[PDB]
């Protein structure tokens, strides 16, 4: 049966949405707004009253004192809106090349594994959204493979810290140590620490 | 003690949200070894350049600089429905995006219009020299500037699969002038 | 004494200006002349203005701007000396500007 | 056929191109750059590095 | 004049710079694919819809 309305077109709505993604800067924010409320409406996740991260309890102890503060200075507060923004960013299209709020931590003691473990758990609940920032997160990960335990860092950097995927296949590792910076995200450079080649 | 209510009730959430009205670009990351954005650009042959994704610092809004510390609260201070179950009705989201797709198409209308006028288009401004005989303010030959050619003619005959216009010979080719122009 | 090339009653002087100024040697100009665009940001920065000063004062003003633009050192190389004044193992995260 | 530099002749010119600066380029301000303390003093290394 | 307001248009606002404004005068803007170097490619079907 006829409706009857002016048929909703496939094209145009794709072009006028594409031009708006060059002039109108807050397009991204409006795309998030519509699909973040759907997460909060479906009632999928909600913050609780009390805290319970690192205990298993009987802590506060004298030996734990060092490990206690390391996890405490890593704790994010259960803000209802901050949780929803993570579930929504997973699907929503972006226009600005966002990168991580960077941390300066020289891996000194065994209690510093509470930083590398954070980058693991972030790479599981959000596998996409981890692709875009894989290079800047690689830059602060090389300190774990150098200061913490060398020899491998000495033989891995020997090959180089960056490659190009081209040659119609294969990989072209450049035998030189360079940093990431994120500014070269959209080019022909993949962070070499995520290669998989042995 | 989380994974069950994390890979069932939360898994069917993305499974549907992956195909909405305003979500379009592929952000897939199942092979970190090889994947790129493949960005497009808005360019005119008359000196203009605007990308869709570009490098810049944080904007005046919370979309840039992704916080990585938002992992510990969602492993401890977050009760799930622990699986009562609520299904959000399709009405509030289908119409929500339908009106956002309206604002864009109605807000981009002015600058796509007033811009179009000062472009001319579908014209050439040419001149014809009378090869004696009897004139007529017509016939002779048809001259056009190279810049007018590249703007209108070149980007249009380029859409189809025709080999670019043949170069005029220093020698005489009154034979194949139209034969190569036929292609 | 050129911008009045057609506004003075004094007849003799008029024909003269519109002869040596019309000349195939010199030419007068005023206003915006050209623009230098930006690499990454993509905005107008250093604009040239066909100003109405004299060669003696205009020469001095250019020595300044050129030595400001040929520094090639951003305001971010400031935090590399701001750090030489604290505990040897500290660091900063620069609000990149370029 | 080039341009004879006007900074060396006698007769004074009265109009010329001056390289100005727009309202985007700004000089001599501040940066809200932040610090992060070495956290512990005991395990710092001035010795070599 | 047709109500639909433009709070910001073409202008990009970085929080550590202020409010920079671009031009809005395109012409025959044919959305085309960019190669890694920063060059317009062309029309190779089976890749670009």
């Amino acid at each position: 049966a006829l409706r009857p309305e002016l048929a909703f077109d496939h094209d145009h709505i794709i072009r006028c949405l594409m031009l708006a993604a060059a002039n109108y800067p807050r397009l991204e924010g409006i795309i998030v707004q519509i699909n973040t409320g759907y997460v909060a409406s479906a009632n999928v996740i909600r913050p609780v009253s009390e805290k319970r991260y690192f205990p298993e309890n009987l802590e506060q102890n004298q030996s734990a004192a060092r490990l206690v503060s390391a996890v405490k200075a890593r704790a994010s507060e259960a803000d209802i809106s901050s949780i929803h923004l993570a579930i929504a960013r997973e699907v929503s299209p972006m226009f600005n090349v966002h990168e991580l709020k960077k941390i300066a931590e020289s891996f000194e003691d065994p209690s510093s594994i509470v930083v590398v473990l954070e980058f693991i758990l972030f790479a599981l609940f959000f596998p996409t959204e981890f692709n875009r920032i894989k290079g800047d997160i690689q830059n602060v990960l090389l300190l774990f493979f150098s200061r913490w335990y060398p020899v491998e860092y000495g033989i891995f950097i020997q090959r180089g810290a960056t490659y190009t995927i081209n040659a119609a296949g294969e990989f072209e590792f450049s035998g030189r140590n360079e940093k990431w910076d994120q500014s070269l995200y959209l080019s022909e450079h993949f962070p070499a620490l995520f290669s998989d080649v042995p | 003690n989380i994974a069950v209510a994390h890979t069932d009730h939360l898994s069917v959430v993305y499974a549907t949200m992956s195909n909405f009205m305003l979500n379009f670009t592929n952000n897939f990351s199942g092979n970190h070894a090889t994947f790129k954005p493949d960005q497009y650009v808005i360019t005119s042959p008359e000196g203009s350049y605007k990308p869709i994704i570009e490098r810049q610092g944080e904007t005046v809004d919370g979309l840039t600089i992704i916080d990585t510390s938002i992992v510990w609260p969602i492993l401890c201070q977050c009760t799930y429905p622990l699986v009562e179950i609520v299904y959000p009705d399709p009405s509030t989201t289908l119409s929500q995006s339908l009106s956002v797709a309206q604002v864009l198409s109605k807000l981009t209308l002015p600058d796509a219009f007033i811009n179009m006028i000062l472009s001319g288009g579908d014209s050439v401004v040419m001149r014809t020299y009378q090869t004696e005989a009897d004139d007529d303010l017509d016939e002779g030959i048809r001259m056009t500037t190279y810049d007018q050619y590249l703007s209108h003619i070149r980007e249009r005959l380029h859409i189809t699969n025709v080999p670019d216009p043949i170069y005029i010979t220093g020698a005489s080719t009154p034979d194949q002038i139209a034969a190569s122009v036929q292609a | 004494p050129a911008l009045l090339r057609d506004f003075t009653q004094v007849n003799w002087l008029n024909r003269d200006i519109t002869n040596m100024l019309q000349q195939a040697g010199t030419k007068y100009g005023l206003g915006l002349t050209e623009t230098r665009l930006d690499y990454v940001r993509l905005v107008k920065t250093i604009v040239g203005h066909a100003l109405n000063i004299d060669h003696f004062a205009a020469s001095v003003l250019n020595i300044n701007l050129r030595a400001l633009m040929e520094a090639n050192v951003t305001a971010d190389d400031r935090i590399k000396a701001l750090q030489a004044h604290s505990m040897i193992s500290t660091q900063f995260h620069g609000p990149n500007q370029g | 056929q080039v341009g004879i530099p006007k900074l060396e002749v006698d007769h004074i010119s009265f109009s010329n191109v001056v390289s100005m600066m727009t309202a985007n380029i700004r000089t001599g301000d501040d940066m809200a750059v932040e610090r992060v303390n070495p956290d512990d003093v005991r395990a710092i290394n001035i010795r070599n590095a | 004049i047709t109500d639909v307001d433009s709070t910001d248009y073409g202008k990009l606002t970085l929080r550590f710079l202020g409010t920079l404004t671009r031009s809005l005068k395109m012409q025959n803007a044919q959305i085309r694919r960019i190669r890694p170097d920063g060059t317009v490619l062309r029309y190779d079907d089976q890749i670009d819809i």
Partner: peptide
């Protein structure tokens, strides 16, 4: 309490 914030941080001030 360690609260979750997004953008860059503000502390000390530079000088020309």
């Amino acid at each position: 309490t360690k609260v979750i914030f997004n953008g860059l941080d503000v502390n000390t001030e530079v000088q020309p």
